[PDB]
Structure formats: C-alpha cells, structure tokens
Design a protein around this nucleic acid. Structure first.
Lengths: 141, 260, 203, 167
RNA sequence: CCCGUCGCUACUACCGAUUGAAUGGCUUAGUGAGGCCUCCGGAUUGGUUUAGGGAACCGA
RNA sequence: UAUCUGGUUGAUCCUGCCAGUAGUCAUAUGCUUGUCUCAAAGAUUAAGCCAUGCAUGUCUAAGUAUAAGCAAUUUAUACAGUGAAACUGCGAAUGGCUCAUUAAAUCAGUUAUCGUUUAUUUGAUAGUAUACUUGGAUAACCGUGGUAAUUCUAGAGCUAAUACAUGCUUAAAAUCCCGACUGUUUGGAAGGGAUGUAUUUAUUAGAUAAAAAUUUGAUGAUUCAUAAUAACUUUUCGAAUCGCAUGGCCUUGUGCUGGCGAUGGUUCAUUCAAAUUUCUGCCCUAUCAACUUUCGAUGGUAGGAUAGUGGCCUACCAUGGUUUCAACGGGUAACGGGGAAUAAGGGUUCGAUUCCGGAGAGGGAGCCUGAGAAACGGCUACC
RNA sequence: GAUAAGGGAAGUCGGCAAAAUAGAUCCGUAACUUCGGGAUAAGGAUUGGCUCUAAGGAUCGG
C-alpha cells in the first residue's frame, strides 16, 4: 500500500521538509484536532498516507450535522456508503413504517472499516458529487 | 431574482412597527446601514407613526431635509435610515432626545432621555481580531469598528461608546450576576440578571436569567445584551416599565386601578 | 455557453432529471487558456463582481523558488518534461499547474556563487574548469572572505540537485495557475519529490 | 441611402454587427449592438453621392468653395489651448485674451466669454493645501493612537510582571 | 311468475384491410445559423519618436 | 347538536344502494331587485393572437454651458442668474403580470459556507523611500447631404470634463542585502541597492506533561486573523475634481497659512443581497422490476474552468451507484407553502389567486453591458 | 461498349434493359415465428499515407 501510487507526487501542501538542516531524516507531517470531542487517531499523527480529504491530516473541516449509521459497502476507494434506518410516523394510523437512507461518506486511511460496522460521520464541504460526510469514529460490529 | 429587492409589502413588514393593514400596499423598506432590516426602525416610522409629528411621508422628507433629525450625533437625510437598538435620536429644533430601547412588550418604545445621557450609547461586542498593520479592533452590534480596544474586551462584552469621538469610555465583562436585556426571541425587552451560562460546543449557548421578581427564563446567548454591572444599576435609562413582565390578569388589574 | 450546473447530470440513483430553468450566468464556465512557452501574451477577463483574471496565452519567464535556500529568482522556462494529468500537455509544451519543467539555472548559479563562494556542477570541462577555477579565487576583500567562511558548512547542496547544474537547466514544478493569475511560477524540485520525478522521467 | 464605411472591402452592401465606436451606428443603450446594412469603402457606379474633400487647388477657383471662407464657431476654452493659440508664455494673464462673441438684444448689446478650465486661482491652491494638511494631520493622530496603545500595553505588561511576581 | 333466439327503433363501446391519420415529448445520424474564445490579418490612425527632406522605428 | 327521514314486501326483519337535508373565500345560470357599508372580478378553455394609447426616467449652491435661449444691468469684460440640447453619472436586474414547465425538482421547517461574490448604506482605513496644476480628441452647435421608409445617419468645420490618457508636489529615524577600502583574530566604514498598499509563488511566526544527572489574538476545529523573508507583475492606487464663505500671521510677498461641505478611492468590517448547501417530509400508477455505466454512471489522483466547492469538465485509474423499506419508468384535467370548507374525536376535500419562495415573457439557443440579468417595455440567430 | 442538363417510369403488356447497392470494423435492427429463424432485416458511422505507442510469446539460468 505504497503512498506514491499516482502520476503526481503525493504531498501535504505547504508542509516543507528541508533536506539540508540536519538529521531526523523523516518528512514532517501536519495534522489537526477536529474538535467536538473527537480524538485524532494514532494513524493520523504517526502515519504516512497522504489524504487531502482526511479530517485530521487533510484540508477539510468538520461542521454542521453529525450522523451515525451502519456501513453497507466498502467497495469504493476511500469512500463508503452507510445505511440510516429510522421510523416514519403516520398520524392517521397512529403507527410507524420502516424507512432508510443511504449516505456516501469519505473514509480516511487512518480508520479501518468493514461492512457491518457502525460509524459516526461529520459534515464537510462537498468533496464529491454525492459525498458530504466524513468518517470520524469506527465501532466494530 | 436578477438582483436586490427595493420594495417592501406592508404585510411583510416587521410586526413590531405597528403598521395598520389598510393604509396602502407598501411599507417603508429600511435602507442598508448599521442594523438589520428586520431588527431596525426606519426613521419615517419613528417620526410619523410614533411621535405623530409628521402627517405623511412627504412631511417626513420636509422635516429631514432641514437638518432637524440626528442619529448618534449625526444628521441623516435618509427618510428610511435603519435606526436600531441603543440608537440615540435627537431633535434639536424641539430640543428633544430619544433612545430606541425595547419595551417588555417587544416594541421600540418612545423613550425621552436627557441631553447628558444623549451623549453616548452601549454596544455589544461581536468579535475582535487584528486588522491591517497588526492593529486589533472590535465590532459592535451596530457595525461600528473601534481600533485599539482594551486588551481585555472579548465577545459578548458591552462597551460604552462616546458619540462625539466614537471612542470607548468603559466596558462591562460578561459573567454571572450581570444586568442584561434580551434583544431577541419570546423574551424580547425583559431585563434580568445572569444566573448561569450553559455551553454547547458547535451548537447554541443558553443563558439562564432572572427578573427582579424571581422568575427564571432562559434565552440564547445571541439574544443577550449586557446593560449594567449589577442588579438595579444599568448604564442607560430604562423604558417606563423597568423591563418587567406582567401576567394578563396583572395588567388588567393595573389598568382598572388607574382607570377605575 | 459552458455551464457548471449539476442539474444536467443524472441522479445518484441513475435517474434522468428534467430541465428546471434556462442556463444562468452565475453558473458559467469559460475556455481553457492552454498556456504555451513563447513571447508574452496575457489577456484580461472580466469576471463576476467586476473582478479581473489574466489568461496567460504565452509566457517566457517565471518566478521560481529555491526552497532549501530561501531565495527566488525570475528565470526562463525551457520546456515541459512531465505532466501528471496528460502527456499530450508535455508533447505540446502546455504550461499548467503541477507541470514539471526545466528552467535556466543561471540566476541561481550567480546567487550561490556570490553567497557561498563556490561552484556547482562538478564538470571539469575544457572551458568549464577555467570558470570554476577562476570562481574559486577572485578579487575579494577580507571581511567578505570571513562572512563567506562562516557561510560555509551550510554550503553543500544535495547531489541530485548539484548534478543538474552542469547543464544550466534545473527541474521545477509550476505552482501558480497560469490561466487564472496570468503568471507561471514554481519551485525547484528537491528531495524525495525530485527523486520521484526523476524515476518517472527515466521510465 | 446606406453610408459607406471604412474597412469594408466591397463595392456592395454588407451586413455588420455594430457596437460602440463603429461609424454608421449610435448606440441607444449601454452595451447595445445592432446588425445594420452598410456600403463598402470601394467606390462604384451604384452610389447616389460621393463625398469629396479638396486636397490642393490647381489652377482655377470654384463658385462657393475656393473663393470664400467661413469662420470657426468657437475659440479656445482650456487655458493652455488659449496659450498655444496665441503663443502666450507661462506668465501672461490668459483672462484678458479670451475670445468674446457679441450678443445683441434690442439695444443692450454685450459679450459672452467662455469660462476657462484648469485655471489656477486662490481656491484651487486652497484645496491643494487642504488635502495635504488633512493627510498630515491624519498621520499625526494615527501615530498618537499607536503610541497610546503601546503605553497601555507596557503598563499592563509590567503590572502583570509584578502581579505574577507576588504569587 | 318467467327464459332465450327472431322482427322494428335508438344509444354506447369493441374488432377491423387501410405498411390509416394527427398532436406533444425524448432521441441516434447528417447538415448547420449566430454569439463567445482563439489565430492570424491590417481600411485606417496617433506618434514608443526620430528623421536635411522625413529616414530607420513604436502604440491603437 | 357525537341526530337522521322516504323507496324492494300482502305484511316483516335485514343487507344494500338510490333519494331527501345542511355548508362551501364554489363556479355557472334563471327569475327578481328600494337604501347604507364592504368587496371578488379573462385562473379553468387557448403560456391563443393582438389595432391603438400609455406603463422608466432622472440635476443640486457643489461634474461639463459662447444655446446665434429668457433675464440682469449687477459684486463682476475669464464664466457667475435662469435655463433647452448634448457629454458624463445613476437607475432601467425593483415593480407589475402569469402558472406553461416542474414529482426529491419546486417548496416547508431546520442546517452550512473553516466553500464563495457582493453596487449601495454605515464604521474604520493610506506621510513611502509642468506642479501656482499635462495632453488631444469628441458630442451638442454651424453647414453640405443620401434613402420611399426607421428613435438611420454620412462627409466637413469648431469647442469642454468627475469623459478618455498621462503625471510630481513628504516628514523623522531605523532594519535587511551587496560591499571598494580598512582595523586585523573577527571590527569601522565610503559607494550602492530594498522598505506603503495591491498581484503571484515559495519559505518562516502564529507556543504551552507537573520533581535530579523567555513573552504573544479568535474558534468546537484550521495551513484562521496577523506578522516576516526572498522575489514577481503588459504595476492596481496612496485626489491634475466641485460649491459656499473667505478669516489669521506679519519677515507685506498677488507670500505663508485655513472653515463648512460635494464628489471620489485601497483594504477590512457591516448592511442590502446572491450562489451553492445538511436533515426530514410530496398525488396516482406493477397492464412500469430492475435501473445507471456506448457519449460521467459511483469513487480516486492531477489539472482546467468558476466568484467559489463539486464529474462542473478533461486525462489516467478502479468497478462502482440506486432498488419490493418500491428504484427506474408512465400519468397528473401538479408551481409549492402560509392557508380554506366541513368539522365529537379520528378524518375528507380545496388552495391559479391580496403574503412568502420558484419559473417564464410566442418557441428554443447564444450573449453585450453592468455590483447584480443568460434581462426580452436589451441585443444576435433560427423556427 | 460508354457518358449526358432538368425531370424521374410520364415509357411499356410489364421497370424489359440499364442504373443504384456491394469489402471490412463499429453501431443499430420491426411484424411474425414451427422459438430453430426472420437478419447482411431496415438503417447509420468509419476506412489513405506517414511517424510512433501499447498488448498478446519461446528457450535458457536458483
């Protein structure tokens, strides 16, 4: 799973590692705290993957809605779709009907996701045609 | 649709203006300026519907073209100038000064003030950051920016602005026990004291308040306005009513006490 | 014209959408600049808000940065050697962001020779070694000798960058957006980024 | 009746999209363009008229063109236009050489004189003084404000030093 | 009490040769007006200004 | 007011509908019609077609007046008042009309912009490393005119600017770079360059785990605000503008100074707004069960384009995305909502239409100008 | 044995004769049907030269 697997060199923008200062010959890595009580995963701080869409080692911020759901597909590259089950109330019959929504969310390499897992996603800016959410917490299922 | 709107339908006008239903199709659209369109009080409304000095809008323009009207110490020739909270209105030719302050009813009551008090105004601090050349500044709730503010002034604090010079006289810290006035929501106009500020990161901050009559009522932090250091000691003159809420039975009893 | 609306696309379910309105001006697009290396030719575009962009049609020179030395010079673009998006851009010498170029190394050579009092290239050429030896010892005062002596130690550069200076052409990557800003600026490739692009170039 | 237009390499009519600046079209609204019929610049036999300008007078005269003259309608109005019209140097009072047309009304005949632009008066120099005075005064007040802020910062800094030196 | 065929009349719908007809939408393929960008071009025009008469030379 | 009555039988008790009864901000129509108040009104069918007239213009003491315009002889032989024309500026993107299109679209309530543009208003905000003030066009105007005809305009002659295009008037020190010489164990220097704000790029600040072998803003959160270094740029702008009053200083020079305003102009903030955007919620239909991915469908990397995010588009790559919890397709005599009628409760039905949002201007498409329009009482083309 | 403006079966018992189509690659293909077909249905696009690039193998050697 080599980092440099593209036509262009993968780098974090404007994080300059000087090849001349002195030793500690490893590239400096930037990361942030997303806030709202979410911890930065260890793979984000000591990792080596480059992901501009990562909430922790990337330029996207988390703001707006916080959602949770069950992962139903991990067949895209760095993107998952999660299922949100809920119950719709029909007043005339004083009852409920089962409904669901599929939401596409970016998954950072800092996490590990498999189908059948519950994840918490935070809302970011549009980062794809269908993606507006980004994984912040993975619960094994 | 293709650009900014310039008319205001009468039924779309804010409900605190007390506009009659049948006078016409339109209502004065407040100009762009220091206060929000919905939370302002255009001067034509204040001088026609409230003071009853002018009989109609054309007389409002006859009055204001002769330099009579001042807001915050400056002559305004705009019939639809967006006067808002704390704004000082001065009528020199009649030698008469006013401050727009909400009443407990939720309206901009007509409040006569003295000439000495008509020399400053309070202002809620919205943000502070450094400008060009490293100079810090604060922004008040009326779009006023003041350079070189006190290093301790933060958001939601209130500064005492000197109208002649636009400089900060003194400020009030936001903390528990402060005399405040509610500037939005259901509790518009009611004066209380801070009891507990409840924090919600990413969401909304709630502020528990208490009146002089011990009734506790909570409000969004955005609707709070610090007006005094402690209970009973504001830095501005209060409307007739002291910002105290009465039940419908109580107001009926007081009306029948002063009229029967 | 060119439109950036998303309503002309199919749904995420694959459904065909119906047209909801005519095309709006606030959702337009324009033609690409396709900047080439040649005598300067910059056109102005009036954009939303009465603002103004500059479309570089042709540019000769650019502002390029030596990151490990903290100095930037206005040098000459020699050509395009690599483009991650499309090799046709290399073939036609089209300058966009992220294109890998060769720039003239002359101004950087003057700066380094004046600053550290040494030479770059390691080419003991016939007439090259004459220049190298002359640069080694020139007419130079004493306080300046001492300041250069203190500046030594931080005077050797990495071998991969050094070996290029014998050609006068240094590898670089464009960082500006020539079709937008009208300028073609960049930085010198060094480190593992330089190693990566050299590996790609040798193919 | 369609006019001839410069640049149209035709002895025939063409149809052009005309905008602000083109001859044969005066725009009615800002940004408005019209498509109009114009005649080419090449002279042919299909022309109703051919406008001509005399370049040189050869041997004889002409009935109402070469043997007469018409005066100019207005004289110079800008100051240096007057000076270049009379060769005046930059010392002569331009006010006393201004052309003055004569207007009659019944019997009280009088003169009309053009107002001169760009003429230096005490008022213009007063304004030039005022702008610089305002700039300098503004710079002074800004420097005073920055100095006051520095003094406040220093007072807070040192009182903080001793206040944390107490603890 | 009551069933169906048959006879007269009226109304509704169905099948039906006519490779029937019309209206509205979408669309492959071919042609393709006109804007816009781009490339030259250069009616004309002022001089980057300099020419003994103007001779090299710039901008729109 | 939580209500029923008539009709199948010779008679009965049922099922069951037909009929009766009351309402309709519900339409039409017939008869009839005295008074006051209030008040809908070419939506339904034909977003069918239109004669004619009108519906968008606009000048203050403060941009440009030699009207061959009227008035004054008065503060005035540079103009001075009033005032057509025309140049310049602004508005014409508001309003008003209609409901054709439109079924996750519009819209409603809730979100987001740490994803952007923003005339104007209101606050702030710039001393930057020929000048007692630069040019040369052009309109109005005069005159020659061409066409049957248009809010067509062409030769030719003048003449203005807050139009167009250029251009100096400035503080005090200090900091960084190169550095001829020189003192010589690391120093003094002559002489040169660079200092504002805009643009572009790169690199540095932008802090905070408690006992033996130095100080910094905001946020839930940032590569934020801001500052610094090196350079960059068909070099942005740091007032060649106007009206009133005109005072003060004597070293009396046509000296120096300076009051109230107009109009400007960089950046930030603010306001008026836009553009995208999260969550959930729509009528009928299976005599629609699979749909999407050829020619973007779902996602990844890089770029282009945009005001900005985004398959928005391009190149390369992966094979994804939706669906019986009803996708996709079809119909709607479907613009959505605030609301309306009926109303024990639960429900049923209506809402083109006084307010809010959207869309359109015979049908399509493409644009100029402008802060803002894919504008139609704007242009271009086709039908 | 050829060619022919404009028309295009009006010629003739009758389109007789002649013309038109035609290879290959890709796309698209109805009624009907004995379910095998109809089918090259119908009907569209492409194709030269030159200079390149990529993919598809064999035998040796751990």
């Amino acid at each position: 799973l080599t980092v440099q697997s593209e036509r262009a060199f993968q780098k974090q923008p404007h994080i300059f590692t000087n090849p001349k200062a002195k030793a500690n010959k490893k590239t400096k890595r930037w990361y942030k705290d997303v806030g709202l009580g979410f911890k930065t995963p260890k793979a984000a701080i000591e990792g080596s993957y480059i992901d501009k869409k990562c909430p922790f080692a990337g330029t996207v911020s988390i703001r707006g809605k916080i959602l949770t759901g069950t992962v139903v597909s991990t067949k895209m590259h760095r993107t998952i779709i999660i299922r949100r089950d809920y119950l719709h109330y029909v007043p005339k019959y004083n009852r409920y009907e089962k409904r669901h929504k599929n939401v596409a969310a970016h998954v950072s390499p800092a996490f590990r996701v498999e189908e059948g897992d519950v994840v918490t996603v935070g809302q970011c800016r549009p980062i794809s045609k269908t993606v507006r959410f980004n994984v912040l917490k993975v619960s094994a299922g | 649709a293709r650009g900014p709107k310039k008319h205001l339908k009468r039924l779309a006008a804010p409900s605190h203006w007390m506009l009659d239903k049948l006078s016409g199709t339109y209502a004065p659209r407040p100009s762009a300026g220091p206060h929000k369109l919905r939370e302002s009080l255009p001067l034509v409304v204040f001088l026609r519907n409230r003071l009853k000095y002018a009989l109609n809008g054309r007389e409002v323009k006859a009055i204001m073209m002769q330099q009579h009207v001042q807001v915050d110490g400056k002559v305004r020739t705009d019939t639809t100038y967006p006067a808002g909270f704390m704004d000082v209105i001065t009528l020199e030719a009649t030698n008469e000064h006013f401050r727009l302050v909400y009443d407990v009813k939720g309206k901009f009551a007509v409040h006569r003030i003295s000439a000495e008090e008509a020399a400053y105004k309070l202002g809620k601090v919205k943000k502070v950051q450094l400008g060009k050349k490293g100079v810090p500044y604060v922004v008040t709730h009326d779009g006023r920016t003041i350079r070189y503010p006190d290093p301790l002034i933060r958001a939601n604090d209130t500064v005492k602005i000197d109208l002649a010079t636009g400089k900060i006289d003194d400020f009030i810290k936001f903390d528990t026990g402060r005399l405040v006035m509610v500037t939005g929501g259901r509790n518009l106009g009611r004066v209380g004291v801070i009891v507990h500020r409840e924090k919600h990161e990413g969401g909304f901050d709630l502020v528990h308040i208490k009146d002089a009559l011990e009734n506790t009522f909570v409000t969004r932090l955005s609707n709070v306005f610090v007006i005094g250091t402690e209970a009973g000691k504001p830095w501005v003159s209060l409307p007739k009513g002291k910002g105290i809420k009465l039940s419908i039975s109580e107001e009926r009893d007081r009306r029948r006490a002063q009229q029967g | 014209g060119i439109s950036r609306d998303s309503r002309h696309k199919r749904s995420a379910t694959g459904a065909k959408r119906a047209q909801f309105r005519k095309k709006r001006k606030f959702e337009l697009g324009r033609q690409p600049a396709n900047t080439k290396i040649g005598p300067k030719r910059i056109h102005s575009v009036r954009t939303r808000g009465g603002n103004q962009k500059f479309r570089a049609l042709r540019v000769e020179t650019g502002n390029f940065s030596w990151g490990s030395e903290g100095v930037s010079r206005k040098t000459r673009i020699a050509g395009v050697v690599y483009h991650p998006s499309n090799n046709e851009l290399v073939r036609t010498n089209t300058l966009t962001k992220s294109a890998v170029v060769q720039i003239d190394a002359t101004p950087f050579r003057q700066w380094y020779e004046n600053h550290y009092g040494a030479t770059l290239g390691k080419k003991k050429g016939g007439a090259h070694a004459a220049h190298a030896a002359e640069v080694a010892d020139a007419k130079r005062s004493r306080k300046v000798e001492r300041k250069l002596a203190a500046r030594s130690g931080a005077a050797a550069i990495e071998s991969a960058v050094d070996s290029q200076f014998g050609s006068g052409r240094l590898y670089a990557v464009i960082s500006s957006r020539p079709g937008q800003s009208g300028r073609c600026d960049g930085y010198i490739l060094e480190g593992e980024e330089l190693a990566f692009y050299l590996r790609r170039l040798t193919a | 009746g369609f006019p001839m237009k410069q640049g149209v390499m035709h002895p025939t009519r063409v149809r052009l999209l005309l905008s602000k600046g083109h001859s044969c079209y005066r725009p009615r609204r800002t940004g408005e363009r019209k498509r109009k019929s114009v005649r080419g610049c090449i002279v042919a036999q299909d022309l109703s008229v051919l406008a001509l300008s005399i370049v040189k007078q050869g041997d004889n005269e002409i009935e109402g063109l070469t043997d007469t003259t018409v005066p100019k309608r207005l004289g110079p109005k800008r100051a240096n236009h007057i000076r270049k019209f009379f060769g005046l140097t930059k010392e002569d009072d331009v006010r006393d050489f201004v052309v003055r047309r004569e207007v009659t009304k019944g019997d009280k005949t009088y003169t009309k004189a053009p107002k001169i632009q760009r003429l230096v008066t005490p008022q213009t120099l007063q304004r030039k003084r005022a702008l610089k005075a305002k700039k300098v005064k503004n710079a002074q007040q800004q420097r005073d404000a920055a100095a006051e802020y520095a003094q406040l910062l220093a007072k807070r800094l040192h009182e903080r030093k001793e206040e944390r030196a107490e603890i």
